[PDB]
Amino acid sequence: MEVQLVESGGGLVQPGGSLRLSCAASGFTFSSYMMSWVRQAPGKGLEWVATISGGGANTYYPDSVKGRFTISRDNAKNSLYLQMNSLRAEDTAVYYCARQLYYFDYWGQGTTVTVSSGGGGSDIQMTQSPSSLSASVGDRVTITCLASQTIGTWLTWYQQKPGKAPKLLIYTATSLADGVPSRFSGSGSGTDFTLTISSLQPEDFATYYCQQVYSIPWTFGGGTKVEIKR
Amino acid sequence: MEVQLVESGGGLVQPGGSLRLSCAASGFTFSSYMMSWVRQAPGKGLEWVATISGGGANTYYPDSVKGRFTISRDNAKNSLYLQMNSLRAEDTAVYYCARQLYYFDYWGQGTTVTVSSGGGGSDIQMTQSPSSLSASVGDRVTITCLASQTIGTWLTWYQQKPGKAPKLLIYTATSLADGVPSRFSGSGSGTDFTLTISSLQPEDFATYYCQQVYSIPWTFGGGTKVEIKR
Amino acid sequence: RPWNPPTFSPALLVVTEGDNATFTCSFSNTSESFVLNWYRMSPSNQTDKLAAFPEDCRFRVTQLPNGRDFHMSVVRARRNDSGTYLCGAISLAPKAQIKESLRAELRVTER
Amino acid sequence: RPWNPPTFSPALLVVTEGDNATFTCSFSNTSESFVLNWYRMSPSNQTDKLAAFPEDCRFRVTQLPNGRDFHMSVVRARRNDSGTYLCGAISLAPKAQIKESLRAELRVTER
Numbered sequence: 144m145e146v147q148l149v150e151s152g153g154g155l156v157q158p159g160g161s162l163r164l165s166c167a168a169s170g171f172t173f174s175s176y177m178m179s180w181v182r183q184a185p186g187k188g189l190e191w192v193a194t195i196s197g198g199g200a201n202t203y204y205p206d207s208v209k210g211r212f213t214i215s216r217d218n219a220k221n222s223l224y225l226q227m228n229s230l231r232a233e234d235t236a237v238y239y240c241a242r243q244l245y246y247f248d249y250w251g252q253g254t255t256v257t258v259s260s261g262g263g264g265s266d267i268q269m270t271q272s273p274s275s276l277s278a279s280v281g282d283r284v285t286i287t288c289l290a291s292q293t294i295g296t297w298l299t300w301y302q303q304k305p306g307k308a309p310k311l312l313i314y315t316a317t318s319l320a321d322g323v324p325s326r327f328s329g330s331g332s333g334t335d336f337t338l339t340i341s342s343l344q345p346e347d348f349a350t351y352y353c354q355q356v357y358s359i360p361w362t363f364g365g366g367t368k369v370e371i372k373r
Numbered sequence: 374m375e376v377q378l379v380e381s382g383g384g385l386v387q388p389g390g391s392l393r394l395s396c397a398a399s400g401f402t403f404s405s406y407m408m409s410w411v412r413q414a415p416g417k418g419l420e421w422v423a424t425i426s427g428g429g430a431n432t433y434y435p436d437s438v439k440g441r442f443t444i445s446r447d448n449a450k451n452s453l454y455l456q457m458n459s460l461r462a463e464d465t466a467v468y469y470c471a472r473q474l475y476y477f478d479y480w481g482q483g484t485t486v487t488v489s490s491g492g493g494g495s496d497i498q499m500t501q502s503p504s505s506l507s508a509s510v511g512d513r514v515t516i517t518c519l520a521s522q523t524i525g526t527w528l529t530w531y532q533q534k535p536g537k538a539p540k541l542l543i544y545t546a547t548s549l550a551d552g553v554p555s556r557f558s559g560s561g562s563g564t565d566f567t568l569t570i571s572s573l574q575p576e577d578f579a580t581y582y583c584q585q586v587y588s589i590p591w592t593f594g595g596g597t598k599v600e601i602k603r
Numbered sequence: 604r605p606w607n608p609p610t611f612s613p614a615l616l617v618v619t620e621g622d623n624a625t626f627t628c629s630f631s632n633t634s635e636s637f638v639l640n641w642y643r644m645s646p647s648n649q650t651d652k653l654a655a656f657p658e659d660c661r662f663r664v665t666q667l668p669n670g671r672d673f674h675m676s677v678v679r680a681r682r683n684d685s686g687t688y689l690c691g692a693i694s695l696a697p698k699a700q701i702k703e704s705l706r707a708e709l710r711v712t713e714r
Numbered sequence: 715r716p717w718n719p720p721t722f723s724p725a726l727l728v729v730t731e732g733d734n735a736t737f738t739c740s741f742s743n744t745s746e747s748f749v750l751n752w753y754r755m756s757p758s759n760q761t762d763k764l765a766a767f768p769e770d771c772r773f774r775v776t777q778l779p780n781g782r783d784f785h786m787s788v789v790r791a792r793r794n795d796s797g798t799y800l801c802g803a804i805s806l807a808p809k810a811q812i813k814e815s816l817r818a819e820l821r822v823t824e825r
């Protein structure tokens with residue numbers, strides 16, 4: 144035949160999405176040439192993204208895509224593939240496949256992949272307001288946590304002392320875990336929740352997280368760190 | 374008898390590598406409680422990674438690790454496992470195993486997983502000559518490329534006209550690709566390279582890129598746009 | 604009867620812009636004959652009165668039912684809301700006297 | 715002896731600061747009796763001579779060996795080097811005479 148490279152698979156995606164690109168070849172001994180994926184941002188220049196040897200036994204990626212992108216090829220079908228996982232805004236580009244020698248020999252006309260900025264979450268996003276805090280021993284401390292959706296009372300409060308693992312403080316947003324002092328208070332339902340330390344103590348020096356266990360994925364707050372001045 | 378969870382398996386992995394985590398349980402009937410891995414990257418907060426049911430019949434994962442991670446439990450050995458495939462630098466964290474009902478009551482003290490690359494800043498960077506230029510038909514244009522390191526004569530020149538894929542012009546920095554007019558010329562070796570157009574023609578309206586093929590990552594230059602000016 | 608000034612916790616608040624920054628003025632009042640003020644140090648050291656209890660829309664004071672504590676919050680805190688704040692107890696009691704609290708800092712970081 | 719003035723390419727150079735900006739003045743010369751001058755327009759809009767072939771330090775002219783073209787370069791080009799540039803052929807063969815080029819623009823972009 145005549146040498147030919149045709150790309151397929153492009154389209155619009157949201158950040159964190161998945162996309163798989165196909166490049167089909169003809170007109171040369173496909174199982175002998177290195178194959179490549181080179182991309183170009185909509186306004187920027189060219190950057191190489193993946194390469195696979197003729198027999199498929201050798202792969203090469205730049206560091207920006209290692210762990211996300213996977214180049215593969217099926218020599219029986221004379222096609223080349225690129226699996227793009229957890230797409231970022233930096234991945235919006237035209238994706239060409241190119242027969243690779245010590246140069247890039249033939250280029251396909253490329254497929255277009257557009258990573259939107261659409262969709263915020265799709266998971267319940269927790270928001271802790273105070274976000275860092277320093278009060279003297281005996282003060283009253285208030286940490287608020289805001290849920291994007293309604294979670295009822297399915298809200299958990301964790302305390303992580305320095306250098307140690309998180310510890311269960313309060314579950315279902317009001318009930319107290321065993322071995323926890325009474326100065327810790329929990330309240331709220333639906334979207335607004337509050338953790339109250341009625342009288343700060345040096346042993347309360349830690350970082351506090353909220354967490355909804357309503358639906359998957361179970362999401363945490365950003366954490367509120369509590370220093371103690373004196 | 375106290376409940377104890379002990380994690381092992383963390384280590385240094387290169388991006389795209391693989392790692393397996395263990396968690397040894399004791400102090401409760403392991404067969405009837407849900408187990409889960411929660412991770413925390415350095416300086417950041419908590420995020421949930423995987424969950425297994427008590428009998429092992431049900432698994433749950435967030436979208437960021439689906440297909441990559443596989444949680445498993447051996448109720449005979451009272452142990453929990455996390456198989457981590459295709460690791461990314463974002464996966465660098467301390468991974469805790471935890472007992473899950475509708476809160477994480479018991480936490481292990483965590484094992485550290487680090488995903489990093491030693492490539493750092495040993496990349497070859499290519500810069501190109503006038504960033505853009507505007508000459509008339511028949512003028513003699515000259516374009517330069519510069520390499521951060523010595524690359525011998527492993528330099529390539531490409532021509533990209535609007536809405537089209539790059540076309541190979543010059544390989545090994547002096548040779549001329551098939552079907553390229555004799556007016557294109559390439560010079561240089563080591564660090565400084567030059568592309569010369571002996572007589573600008575209307576069909577030379579394009580942007581020109583250089584590219585080293587000496588060592589990965591195969592990097593391109595910023596390009597030089599050549600406008601046939603009014 | 605010497606009555607002690609209110610306390611203003613926390614001494615430092617680090618809230619990201621767009622969120623709610625809530626302070627807590629605690630006052631163990633001897634009488635019911637008092638009002639509360641919330642001040643902010645202007646660059647000229649002039650204590651600028653933000654809000655009062657009882658009573659701008661962004662500066663709200665709410666009274667907690669425990670009869671001791673008050674919540675003083677900045678709704679949708681802007682970045683230049685960073686500065687020095689304090690609460691103040693005015694005594695309408697047999698003798699009229701103002702007693703300010705220890706000043707505290709508030710930082711508003713960027714998103 | 716009617717002879718045409720030289721040409722000065724490219725008409726617009728857009729160089730990042732710190733690089734080498736290279737113009738190309740081409741002259742189809744009737745004789746060997748001539749020199750070349752590289753002018754830059756002042757804010758007063760008349761030619762300031764930078765360098766001449768044959769013979770500053772950051773303005774070097776070289777004779778491309780094709781007997782037609784000359785490379786006139788700005789080494790380590792600064793930001794304020796942007797302006798209007800041109801070349802001029804000074805014939806010394808009978809009737810000394812100067813014929814300027816078409817003016818070309820230089821733009822230096824900041825890093």
Ligand SMILES: *[C@@H]1O[C@H](CO[C@@H]2O[C@@H](C)[C@@H](O)[C@@H](O)[C@@H]2O)[C@@H](O[C@@H]2O[C@H](CO)[C@@H](O[C@H]3O[C@H](CO)[C@@H](O)[C@H](O[C@H]4O[C@H](CO)[C@@H](O)[C@H](O)[C@@H]4O)[C@@H]3O)[C@H](O)[C@H]2NC(C)=O)[C@H](O)[C@H]1NC(C)=O
Nearest residue numbers: 742743744745746747748749767768777778779780781782
């Ligand atoms: C247009 O101008 C070019 C450029 O001229 C040069 O640059 C300008 C600025 C002035 O400084 C001129 O004086 C310069 O010459 C012309 O280009 C030159 O043309 C001459 C004509 O031959 C070239 O000549 C010589 O040099 C070479 C070595 O480089 C010698 O080997 C040549 O020959 C001798 O030796 C032969 C045996 O070995 C013998 O048979 C001969 O009798 C002779 O003795 C010769 O001396 C010169 O190299 C050219 N330079 C360039 C850069 O091209 C061009 O001719 C002009 N055109 C017109 C129509 O005037």
Ligand SMILES: *[C@@H]1O[C@H](CO[C@@H]2O[C@@H](C)[C@@H](O)[C@@H](O)[C@@H]2O)[C@@H](O[C@@H]2O[C@H](CO)[C@@H](O[C@H]3O[C@H](CO[C@H]4O[C@H](CO)[C@@H](O)[C@H](O)[C@@H]4O)[C@@H](O)[C@H](O)[C@@H]3O)[C@H](O)[C@H]2NC(C)=O)[C@H](O)[C@H]1NC(C)=O
Nearest residue numbers: 632633634635636637638639656657666667668669670671
């Ligand atoms: C210190 O001050 C508090 C608060 O004083 C109040 O606020 C200041 C700013 C001034 O405006 C005062 O004028 C206010 O009183 C003291 O508390 C108050 O004490 C009252 C009895 O002396 C008590 O009584 C009345 O209301 C009862 C029902 O309360 C309803 O309203 C309150 C809010 O005010 C609410 O928390 C509650 O849940 C009810 O909805 C009623 O049962 C009584 O019979 C009486 O009619 C006030 O409730 C109480 N206020 C608060 C906020 O606690 C305190 O006594 C002062 N201490 C000293 C030592 O003087």
Ligand SMILES: *[C@@H]1O[C@H](CO[C@@H]2O[C@@H](C)[C@@H](O)[C@@H](O)[C@@H]2O)[C@@H](O[C@@H]2O[C@H](CO)[C@@H](O)[C@H](O)[C@H]2NC(C)=O)[C@H](O)[C@H]1NC(C)=O
Nearest residue numbers: 270272287289335621622623625663664665674676678679
């Ligand atoms: C930021 O605050 C507003 C309202 O502020 C409240 O007053 C403060 C003194 C504080 O102590 C908060 O707990 C109070 O809620 C929040 O919005 C409201 O939501 C309720 C829902 O029932 C609604 O009826 C109100 O009209 C809302 N008011 C406003 C001004 O929006 C808002 O959600 C808070 N945001 C964060 C991130 O905390």
Ligand SMILES: *[C@@H]1O[C@H](CO[C@@H]2O[C@@H](C)[C@@H](O)[C@@H](O)[C@@H]2O)[C@@H](O[C@@H]2O[C@H](CO)[C@@H](O)[C@H](O)[C@H]2NC(C)=O)[C@H](O)[C@H]1NC(C)=O
Nearest residue numbers: 517519565732733734735773774775776785787788789790
């Ligand atoms: C920018 O140019 C300078 C000097 O230009 C050279 O000389 C002109 C007359 C012309 O022929 C150009 O094509 C030449 O490249 C380069 O300078 C180096 O200068 C040092 C002295 O400081 C000298 O030791 C080196 O040998 C010179 N290198 C070369 C290649 O000539 C300079 O490297 C150029 N910079 C860039 C970014 O291209």
Ligand SMILES: *[C@@H]1O[C@H](CO)[C@@H](O)[C@H](O)[C@H]1NC(C)=O
Nearest residue numbers: 644645646647648649650706
């Ligand atoms: C006045 O301002 C100075 C700094 O200029 C500060 O040290 C001092 O505490 C301020 N005093 C008051 C009452 O605001």
Ligand SMILES: *[C@@H]1O[C@H](CO)[C@@H](O)[C@H](O)[C@H]1NC(C)=O
Nearest residue numbers: 645646680681682683684685
């Ligand atoms: C703070 O920023 C707002 C803009 O959101 C502006 O209107 C106001 O004048 C600023 N105040 C000060 C003291 O800078």
Ligand SMILES: *[C@@H]1O[C@H](CO)[C@@H](O)[C@H](O)[C@H]1NC(C)=O
Nearest residue numbers: 756757792793794795796797
């Ligand atoms: C250009 O800037 C340099 C600063 O490096 C200065 O010395 C020089 O005088 C300036 N020349 C003009 C024409 O602006």
